[PDB]
Amino acid sequence: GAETLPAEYAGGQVARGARLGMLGNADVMDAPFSITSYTARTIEQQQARSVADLLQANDPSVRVVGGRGDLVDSYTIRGFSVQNADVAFNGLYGLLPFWRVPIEFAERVEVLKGPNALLGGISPGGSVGGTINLVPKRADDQPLTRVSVDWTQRGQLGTHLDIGRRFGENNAFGVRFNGVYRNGDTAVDHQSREFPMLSLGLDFRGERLRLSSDLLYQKESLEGVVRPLLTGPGTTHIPHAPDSKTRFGLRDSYLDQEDYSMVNRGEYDLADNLTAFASIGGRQSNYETIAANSILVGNQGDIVNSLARQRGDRRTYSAEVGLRGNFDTGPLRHDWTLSANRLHERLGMVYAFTGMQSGNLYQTSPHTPLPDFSSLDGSIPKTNETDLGGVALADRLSFLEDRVQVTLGVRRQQIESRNYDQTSGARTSHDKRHVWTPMASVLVKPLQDLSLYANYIQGLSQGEAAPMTAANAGQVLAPYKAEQYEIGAKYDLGGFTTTLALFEIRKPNAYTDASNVFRADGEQRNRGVELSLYGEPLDGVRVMAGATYIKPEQNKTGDPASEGKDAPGVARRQANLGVSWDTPFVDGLTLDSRWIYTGSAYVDSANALAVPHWNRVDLGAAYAFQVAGKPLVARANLENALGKDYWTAANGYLSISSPRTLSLSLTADF
Ligand SMILES: O=C(O)[C@H]1CSC(c2ccccc2O)=N1
Ligand SMILES: O=C(O)[C@H]1CSC(c2ccccc2O)=N1
Ligand SMILES: [Fe+3]
Numbered sequence: 320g321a322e323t324l325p326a327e328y329a330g331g332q333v334a335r336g337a338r339l340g341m342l343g344n345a346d347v348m349d350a351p352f353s354i355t356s357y358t359a360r361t362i363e364q365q366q367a368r369s370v371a372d373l374l375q376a377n378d379p380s381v382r383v384v385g386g387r388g389d390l391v392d393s394y395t396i397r398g399f400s401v402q403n404a405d406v407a408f409n410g411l412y413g414l415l416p417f418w419r420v421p422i423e424f425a426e427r428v429e430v431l432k433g434p435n436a437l438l439g440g441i442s443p444g445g446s447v448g449g450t451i452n453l454v455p456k457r458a459d460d461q462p463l464t465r466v467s468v469d470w471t472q473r474g475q476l477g478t479h480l481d482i483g484r485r486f487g488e489n490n491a492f493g494v495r496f497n498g499v500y501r502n503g504d505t506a507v508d509h510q511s512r513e514f515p516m517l518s519l520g521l522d523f524r525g526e527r528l529r530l531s532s533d534l535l536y537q538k539e540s541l542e543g544v545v546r547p548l549l550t551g552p553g554t555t556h557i558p559h560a561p562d563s564k565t566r567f568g569l570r571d572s573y574l575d576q577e578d579y580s581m582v583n584r585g586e587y588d589l590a591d592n593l594t595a596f597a598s599i600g601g602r603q604s605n606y607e608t609i610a611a612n613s614i615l616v617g618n619q620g621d622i623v624n625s626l627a628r629q630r631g632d633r634r635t636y637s638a639e640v641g642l643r644g645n646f647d648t649g650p651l652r653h654d655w656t657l658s659a660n661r662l663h664e665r666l667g668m669v670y671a672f673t674g675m676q677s678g679n680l681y682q683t684s685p686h687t688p689l690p691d692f693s694s695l696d697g698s699i700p701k702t703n704e705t706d707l708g709g710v711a712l713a714d715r716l717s718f719l720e721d722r723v724q725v726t727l728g729v730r731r732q733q734i735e736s737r738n739y740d741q742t743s744g745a746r747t748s749h750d751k752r753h754v755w756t757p758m759a760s761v762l763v764k765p766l767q768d769l770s771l772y773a774n775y776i777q778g779l780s781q782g783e784a785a786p787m788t789a790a791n792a793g794q795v796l797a798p799y800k801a802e803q804y805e806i807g808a809k810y811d812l813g814g815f816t817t818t819l820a821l822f823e824i825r826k827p828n829a830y831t832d833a834s835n836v837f838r839a840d841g842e843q844r845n846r847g848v849e850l851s852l853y854g855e856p857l858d859g860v861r862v863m864a865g866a867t868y869i870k871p872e873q874n875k876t877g878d879p880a881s882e883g884k885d886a887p888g889v890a891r892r893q894a895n896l897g898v899s900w901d902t903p904f905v906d907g908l909t910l911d912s913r914w915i916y917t918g919s920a921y922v923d924s925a926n927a928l929a930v931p932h933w934n935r936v937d938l939g940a941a942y943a944f945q946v947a948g949k950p951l952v953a954r955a956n957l958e959n960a961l962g963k964d965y966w967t968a969a970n971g972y973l974s975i976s977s978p979r980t981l982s983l984s985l986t987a988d989f
């Protein structure tokens with residue numbers, strides 16, 4: 320079953336399989352890629368509210384830029400940036416909240432590392448580091464009436480309902496509802512947040528037919544918006560990170576961000592060896608904000624805050640259609656897939672940058688003036704239109720009793736966009752391109768519990784427009800094609816698994832040359848090693864650990880100051896260690912501890928501005944019991960227990976850490 324939910328692995332904190340785009344779901348041991356899938360059980364035990372909450376705490380390959388006090392999270396994977404807008408939904412792009420994906424309705428959060436253009440086509444944001452994928456909850460046969468209430472520092476009060484039922488003869492239909500409302504002061508100075516959310520997972524199970532519909536509504540409202548710190552022209556050293564409770568940006572900033580979507584999916588078995596599938600979905604996303612980015616000035620901690628208003632109205636549709644089947648050519652079995660997809664978007668995005676206000680890193684800002692931004696009032700004009708569409712064919716060849724598996728495929732990807740001036744309405748650019756893109760993989764199973772593998776696959780990004788100072792100001796460059804080679808090994812001991820991987824990812828870079836011409840003449844070469852252990856090695860001791868090493872080389876630049884240096888915002892070393900322990904001496908009590916480490920990194924391409932390594936420690940506890948015949952669970956989570964302040968590096972800017980943060984919750988099943 321291509322859409323069959325993979326089972327939980329030993330310990331119940333990760334799953335045994337995950338999605339590979341058009342190929343559907345595959346088991347960890349049958350996948351020639353590094354995949355990880357985190358369960359709803361992990362989400363609930365740790366009290367994780369967003370994708371960033373989950374991945375930062377547990378995964379050694381993923382690091383978050385922005386954070387929960389900002390309006391947006393992005394993610395760094397295998398030394399490249401991954402946009403939140405590029406998070407997939409059962410494989411499909413364009414259907415989840417654009418700036419920050421909430422996960423209290425999710426059954427799984429999967430990470431596939433490296434590019435995967437053949438498997439799912441281009442990402443809307445052009446990300447090539449990896450693909451994160453959410454799986455929605457579904458109604459189980461046993462009905463579910465689950466209520467919890469929660470408290471988060473300093474005054475956020477929340478409630479979450481999770482209710483499921485099935486109906487029709489043979490439980491043919493299912494309905495799962497999730498409702499959340501969390502409101503109050505956050506852990507940062509003079510900030511509050513309000514968050515309502517609604518989701519419905521509906522499904523039908525038939526003899527030859529399976530259908531589902533997912534509906535989601537979400538809104539995040541902030542009074543006070545944290546923003547990055549940018550370098551300046553004369554920055555010579557990065558100052559020490561301030562107390563993470565300080566809020567050094569615009570005092571009276573706000574955000575209102577709303578997203579809602581619907582997607583229908585289906586499968587119909589035409590015969591014992593043929594199946595047709597299709598999906599169609601749409602998303603609306605509305606954005607309103609005034610806030611400011613902080614620019615370093617001098618080198619003792621003084622800043623200038625650069626103010627802006629922004630408004631956004633984004634309309635997206637997303638579709639796929641295909642067939643899957645299987646036939647035997649002697650001692651060779653063919654498992655094949657023919658697939659086509661299509662994304663189309665209309666965007667209105669307006670903005671005005673007015674205001675430069677004095678500040679300081681180590682002081683929470685006073686009320687300052689908000690400039691007159693009424694020139695953006697009224698209807699939001701169209702500024703971009705995008706169309707992405709593709710066709711792909713893939714075939715998995717199995718032989719020697721499935722112990723050798725060779726996968727081949729190719730995809731034709733079309734790209735098109737138009738842009739219009741936000742004040743004038745004038746047509747500015749119209750890009751149209753196509754690219755053919757393939758994959759090849761081979762997996763061998765010398766033992767029933769040991770797999771070895773190698774892959775080759777590509778990533779694609781739309782070309783950038785030249786800056787309006789360069790000689791080719793308006794011109795959009797040709798697409799950037801990344802190429803991955805990977806080899807690895809996976810060893811399942813039954814109770815726990817060890818994996819090892821080595822990869823290389825090469826991708827072109829664009830820079831303004833000596834003659835002031837914008838060109839994709841640069842190249843990046845990221846080579847890395849990945850190690851991980853997860854499972855339940857002793858009864859009642861659950862462990863998730865891992866470590867990565869990457870050399871992110873700027874191997875081709877126009878500048879002797881940057882040639883062969885490291886790409887900015889990529890630490891060479893990263894590690895994570897999580898433990899969860901059912902105490903043998905108290906019935907129903909579980910203790911958790913996590914340690915996250917990020918090594919030193921640079922902010923500039925010349926590597927003149929370094930930022931230090933950092934560590935975060937989390938502590939947790941859960942006590943399960945019964946009242947009047949009902950199961951209940953009380954939980955605590957202390958994030959950043961040691962109260963450390965640290966910068967996360969990116970390309971030309973830094974984002975501040977979150978303060979020590981305690982959350983408490985009580986769950987009951989009725
Ligand atoms: O450049 C970007 O990526 C966007 C993300 S939101 C953003 C922003 C938002 C509010 C105020 C100022 C900003 O630069 N910048
Ligand atoms: O968020 C940032 O870093 C700044 C860089 S320029 C910038 C911007 C420029 C044009 C339009 C929107 C923007 O956010 N945002
Ligand atoms: Fe910006």
Ligand SMILES: [K+]
Nearest residue numbers: 702703738739
């Ligand atoms: K545009």
